[PDB]
Each structure stands twice: as structure tokens, then as C-alpha cells.
């Protein structure tokens, strides 16, 4: 990239937004988020993603639940009401900036 | 804001993009950038702005020159060819993320 600092800063925000958007549509496992983010073109390792997930729950924007499904313990994440509101606000900021420069 | 970490991350990118867009259109004084960024709705202090400006020059994306105009010495900033290309790349990343989540 010509502007690696922009890409670096912008990716953090992009990831955060994608996590919230996916977790508002439906419940998600961390492992699936890694694959899904990759499909959308973001290079993310579990080592980077899980701390983001935990932070989002700490921020009250996600909530996780322990589930035992098919003899296997798994954590699922979903958006809280605060998360859906955050998503609206974040999307709004994106849309505004998109409208302005494009 | 519901998601202050998103807003914080997103604002850095937004500012960076605005600096490059203004400095591609015309030459700018740092003091004027502060006012202009304020008009566009970004809280920026000289203490935050000048390090960003210096970083952009170090990255080869801006160039500054000491200029004496009307018996008065001033520093002006403008985008380099690399800066115009960075602006295109950054805008492109924005467009992509806009397409994805809207
Ligand atoms: Zn997706
Ligand atoms: Zn602009
Ligand atoms: Zn302007
Ligand atoms: Zn603006």
C-alpha cells in the first residue's frame, strides 16, 4: 500500500464494523468470523481477532454464551441492543464520509 | 458515541484522508487545516495535527516548504505524486467498506 498507516488504522475500524454487522444478522463463532473476514478481504489471525471479540463484549456491544453442542463446548457471540445502536452510528459515519468523497 | 473505539479509529483515518484531499487540491498552511478540519466536524488540536503532517511527509505523501511571502515566513504543505496515489488507494478502501456494510 502507498499509505500503510491509513490501511492499518482503517482496517481496525473495518474489522470492528464487520464483527458487529455479522453478529447483528445472526450468532457467530470466532472461527467462522476469521473465515468470513477473510472472504471480505481482511487479513486477520485468531490471535488478533479473539482480543477484539473480548473487547467488544467488555464494551457491551457483543454478548457471548457458552454452549455445549454435539459433545463440544463452544462460545457464540451476538450483538446486544447497544451493539445494534453502535452499528447504526458507525454505519452512519461511514456513509457520510463515503457520500462526501465519492 | 455508542462505539467510541470505532469513532476514534475511524476519525484518524477520516482526518488523514481529509488532509490528503485538501493538500492535493491546493497548498495549505497548518493553521488553516485546523480550521478546515473543524468545519468538516473533526476535533483537532495543533498538538495532534502537526505530528500527523510530519508523519505524512516522512512517508513521502506530503512535502512542506518554508516560504517567504509578503516579508513573512510560512510553512506550506502539498501532496506529492505518492500522496495523490495514496489518496486514490485510501478512497478505494473506503468505497469497498461502504459497499460491504451498507
Ligand atoms: Zn459477510
Ligand atoms: Zn475530501
Ligand atoms: Zn474543505
Ligand atoms: Zn468532511
Swiss-Prot record, chains A, B:
Instruction: Kindly give the Pfam families that the UniProt entry links to this protein.
Output: PadR (PF03551)
Entry GO MF terms: DNA binding; metal ion binding
- Annotated InterPro entries: Metal_resp_DNA-bind_regulator, Tscrpt_reg_PadR_N, WH-like_DNA-bd_sf, WH_DNA-bd_sf
The entry describes its oligomerization and partners as: Homodimer.
Give UniProt keywords alphabetically: Cadmium, DNA-binding, Metal-binding, Transcription, Transcription regulation
**Effect the entry attributes to changing residue 22 to A:** Abolishes cadmium and zinc binding
Q: Which residues bind Cd(2+)?
A: 22, 36, 40
Tree of life domain: Bacteria
Q: Which PANTHER family match?
A: PADR-FAMILY TRANSCRIPTIONAL REGULATOR (PTHR33169), TRANSCRIPTIONAL REGULATOR RV3488 (PTHR33169:SF14)
Comment field on protein domains: Contains an N-terminal winged-helix-turn-helix (wHTH) DNA-binding domain and a C-terminal alpha helix, which is mainly involved in dimerization. Binding of cadmium causes subtle conformational changes in all key metal-binding residues and conserved DNA-binding residues.
Protein name in the entry: Transcriptional regulator Rv3488
What is the purpose of this protein? May have transcription regulation and metal-detoxifying functions through which it may enhance intracellular survival of mycobacteria. Binds to its own promoter region and to the Rv1999c promoter region. It displays strong affinity for cadmium ions, but can also bind zinc, manganese and nickel. Expression increases the intracellular survival of recombinant M.smegmatis in murine macrophage cell line and increases its tolerance to cadmium ions.
Amino acid at each position: 500500500a502507498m499509505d500503510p498507516e491509513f490501511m492499518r488504522e482503517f482496517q481496525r475500524a473495518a474489522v470492528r464494523l464487520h464483527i458487529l454487522h455479522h453478529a447483528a444478522d445472526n450468532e457467530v463463532h470466532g472461527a467462522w468470523l476469521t473465515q468470513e473476514l477473510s472472504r471480505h478481504g481482511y487479513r486477520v489471525s485468531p490471535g488478533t481477532l479473539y482480543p477484539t471479540l473480548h473487547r467488544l463484549e467488555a464494551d457491551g456491544l457483543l454478548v457471548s454464551e457458552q454452549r455445549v453442542v454435539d459433545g463440544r463446548a463452544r462460545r457464540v457471540y451476538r450483538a446486544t441492543p447497544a451493539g445494534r445502536a453502535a452499528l447504526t452510528e458507525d454505519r452512519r459515519a461511514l456513509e457520510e464520509l463515503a457520500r462526501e468523497v465519492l
